């Protein structure tokens, strides 16, 4: 969960390589998108849209084995100075779009690194961020210019718990090399099923393999398979996705003066061509 | 007077006459500009390039920070550098469109195959500008681009390595690399491009534009 | 009209030029004022104004400090290096890639000789040439875009 | 690092140029020559 | 990101023709 | 877009008109 990134990697969700720590546990891979305007003026509220698409009509394995829908979460790194817009400055139509999203900073201070979710996949297939652009005029250490935004969006249950132990939304290889004899199936009355399995004969051999319910087996009895080969098929239908983009904290005077200069240029060009036209005449009169 | 002053000594008039005696034939359309736009792009590079040499610091400890200084605290630094960036890409592009006009106009054929050859050389030089400038901010992108291309030449047998060590200042990318790339970008390549631009244009003034289609 | 002067085909000097394919700046509209002094500035100012406009609307970014221990995931050369880069990464024998790269300039040099056989400028009157050009152009654009895809999905451009 | 605007710009100009170039060869391949060659 | 590329391509391509036609028209209205 | 289009038209428009405007203005006070 977004809040496990903070727990295991407190300082930042992003490694020097650009890879986000989510991937460290959500081992699958699905597309992720960000949308911000190309430019924003200083001190303005604008929309920043995260997209986490997936097949809505498809469920995944729950911890015990059920088959529930799946949820989405995300981390969104905006530029220094940027922050979630104050509620009273979010106009209504936007407020409707955003929803009951509990934007929470990665750590105290990092108000531009926002964590989001668990949120219900069905409706938060895309996620609006009302964000407020900083102002170089009242924060002398925030400058105009073009900055990066990094996204790290997920959907579906992870594969490793902050403790280290695997979850059940992945496949369970095989403990040893050789011949198997018995596919049992416990169920201690609290912790559900455990399709137990052993492998033997080769070097003496007797060793066991407990495997949590949720996946499907595509194994059958008596096989002679190797040490670490797929005996469990793959349950995961979620997976993690990244996306980077750029936004321009634009000073309007840069634009206004540029437009001026452009006009001056079109004007000079005119005068030049007209001048040629005058000369094109004189030249006929020779 | 003056025309007289200069005419008496230097023969300014003959100069005026070579200019006012070249004519442009009907077949020369707008694409015959691409060469001059490619040049205009470069002059822009020379101006803004030179300007940035007054603040940029070619040291692994200093380079990146000097770039953010030019962006943030230098007067119009953001503009000057944004121009250098854009106009760098525009030069390469206009050069390509220029090569298109040449080829789809047969203007590279006898007696102009040296203009074409010096042109190819110009294109290699320009790409060299781009590659070296790319690495000067000594940021993540620029640094890993160098770390990748610099190794390419090691496949070449006999020399390969030696070539690579030569244009990176040793084994591995580091300060020596940045130092050498800075020399390249702001001293070697500007002189080379100037020579071969000189030859390009001289041969052109001598032979005039290619014929009609 | 514009303003025009016809080839003085009675000038043996101009004829001896034209003969070696080379008298074409002797006739047409006069370059001085007309072109050099009136429209050249329009092209220069125009070229400058477009770049300035782009520079202001989409200014240069500053990336992260280079880290010699941390390879970026995203890591491309500039656009005009895409094709060569596609070639370089997607050809497993390194010396073959280097050679294929050098072949681009070296090859391009040979062209005027290779195509010196006939004397045609117009691309329609040299169909073989114009074809190999368009083919090469296409393969270039293709390779360039391919640089932009993941390596496995690179050559198929993700369609087959 | 990639910058589409530049890429889209490159493409539109490459195809517009290649186009206009063939258009000009054609327009001349076809009411060609005059005034002497 | 990708919407930018298409905008840029369409416009760089097509606006050429707008300026072209505009030039040709300016010519028509001056007479030659 | 739609607002971009409108502005664009109008921007060119003013200028085309300043051109045409200025030939004649200039022309029929005999200057071209």
């Amino acid at each position: 969960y977004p809040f496990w990134a903070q727990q295991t990697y407190p300082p930042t969700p992003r490694e020097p390589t650009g890879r986000i720590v989510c991937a460290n546990c959500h081992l699958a891979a699905k597309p992720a998108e960000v949308e911000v305007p190309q430019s924003v003026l200083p001190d303005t509220v604008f929309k920043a849209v995260v997209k986490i698409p997936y097949d809505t009509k498809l469920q995944q394995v729950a911890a015990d084995g059920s088959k529930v829908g799946l949820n989405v979460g995300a981390v969104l790194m905006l530029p220094e100075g940027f922050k979630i817009a104050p509620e009273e400055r979010i106009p209504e139509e936007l407020k409707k779009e955003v929803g009951d999203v509990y934007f929470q900073p990665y750590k105290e201070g990092q108000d531009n690194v926002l964590l989001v979710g668990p949120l219900p996949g069905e409706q938060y297939q895309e996620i609006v961020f009302p964000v407020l652009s900083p102002n170089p005029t009242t924060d002398k250490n925030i400058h105009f210019g073009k900055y990066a935004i990094h996204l790290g969006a997920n959907r579906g249950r992870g594969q490793i718990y902050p403790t280290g132990e695997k979850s059940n939304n992945n496949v369970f290889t095989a403990s040893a090399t050789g011949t198997i004899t018995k596919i049992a199936k416990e169920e201690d009355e609290y912790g559900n099923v455990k399709y137990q399995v052993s492998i033997q004969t080769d070097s003496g051999k007797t060793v066991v393999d407990t495997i949590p319910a949720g996946p499907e087996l595509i194994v059958s009895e008596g096989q002679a398979v190797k040490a670490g080969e797929a005996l469990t098929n793959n349950p995961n239908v979620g997976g993690f996705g990244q996306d980077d983009t750029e936004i321009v904290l634009q000073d309007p005077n840069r634009v206004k003066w540029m437009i001026a200069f452009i006009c001056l240029v079109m004007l000079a060009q005119l005068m030049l061509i007209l001048k040629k036209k005058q000369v094109e005449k004189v030249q006929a009169a020779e | 007077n003056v025309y007289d002053w200069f005419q008496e000594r230097l023969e300014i008039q003959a100069l005026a006459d070579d200019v006012t005696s070249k004519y442009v034939p009907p077949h020369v359309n707008i694409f015959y500009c691409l060469g001059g736009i490619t040049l205009t792009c470069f002059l822009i590079q020379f101006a803004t390039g030179f300007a940035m040499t007054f603040y940029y610091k070619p040291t692994v400890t200093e380079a990146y920070a000097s770039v953010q200084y030019i962006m943030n605290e230098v007067s119009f630094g953001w503009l000057i550098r944004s121009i250098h960036r854009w106009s760098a890409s525009m030069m390469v592009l206009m050069m390509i469109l220029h090569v298109f006009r040449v080829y789809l106009t047969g203007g590279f054929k006898k007696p102009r195959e040296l203009t074409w050859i010096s042109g190819v050389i110009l294109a290699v030089i320009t790409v060299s500008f781009g590659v070296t400038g790319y690495s000067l901010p000594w940021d993540q992108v620029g640094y890993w681009a160098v770390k990748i291309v610099s190794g390419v030449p090691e496949a070449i047998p006999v020399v390969g390595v030696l070539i690579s060590d030569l244009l990176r200042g040793g084994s591995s990318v580091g300060q020596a690399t940045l130092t050498r790339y800075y020399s390249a970008h702001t001293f070697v390549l500007p002189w080379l491009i100037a020579v071969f631009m000189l030859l390009h244009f001289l041969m052109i003034r001598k032979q005039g534009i290619s014929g009609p289609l | 009209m514009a303003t025009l002067k016809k080839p003085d085909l009675s000038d043996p000097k101009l004829r001896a030029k034209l003969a070696k394919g080379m008298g074409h700046n002797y006739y047409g509209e006069p370059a001085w004022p007309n072109d050099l002094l009136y429209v050249f500035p329009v092209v220069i100012m125009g070229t400058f104004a477009c770049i300035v406009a782009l520079s202001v609307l989409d200014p240069a970014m500053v990336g992260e400090p280079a880290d010699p221990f941390a390879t970026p995931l995203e890591i491309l050369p500039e656009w005009y290096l895409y094709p060569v880069f596609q070639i370089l990464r997607s050809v497993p024998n390194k010396l073959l890639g280097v050679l294929l790269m050098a072949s681009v300039p070296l090859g391009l040099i040979l062209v005027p000789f290779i195509e010196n056989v006939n004397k045609f400028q117009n691309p329609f009157r040299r169909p073989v040439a114009t074809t190999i050009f368009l083919f090469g152009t296409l393969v270039t654009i293709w390779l360039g875009i391919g640089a932009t895809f993941p390596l496995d999905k690179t050559l198929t451009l993700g369609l087959f | 690092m990639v910058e589409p605007l530049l890429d889209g710009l490159v493409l539109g100009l490459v195809f517009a140029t290649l186009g206009g170039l063939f258009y000009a060869a054609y327009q001349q391949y076809k009411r060609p020559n005059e005034l002497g060659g | 990101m990708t919407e930018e590329m298409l905008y840029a391509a369409l416009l760089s391509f097509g606006l050429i023709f707008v300026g072209w036609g505009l030039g040709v028209l300016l010519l028509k209205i001056q007479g030659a | 877009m739609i607002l971009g289009a409108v502005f664009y038209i109008v921007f060119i428009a003013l200028f085309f008109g300043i051109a045409v405007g200025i030939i004649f203005a200039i022309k029929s006070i005999k200057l071209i």
Partner: peptide, 29 residues
Amino acid sequence: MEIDVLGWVALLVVFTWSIAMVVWGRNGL
């Protein structure tokens, strides 16, 4: 948030107007 739009537009306008002035000036292709 649409001085921004005039901004981009002005780019498109000099791009267009330059080509226009070239063609016009040299009666051009």
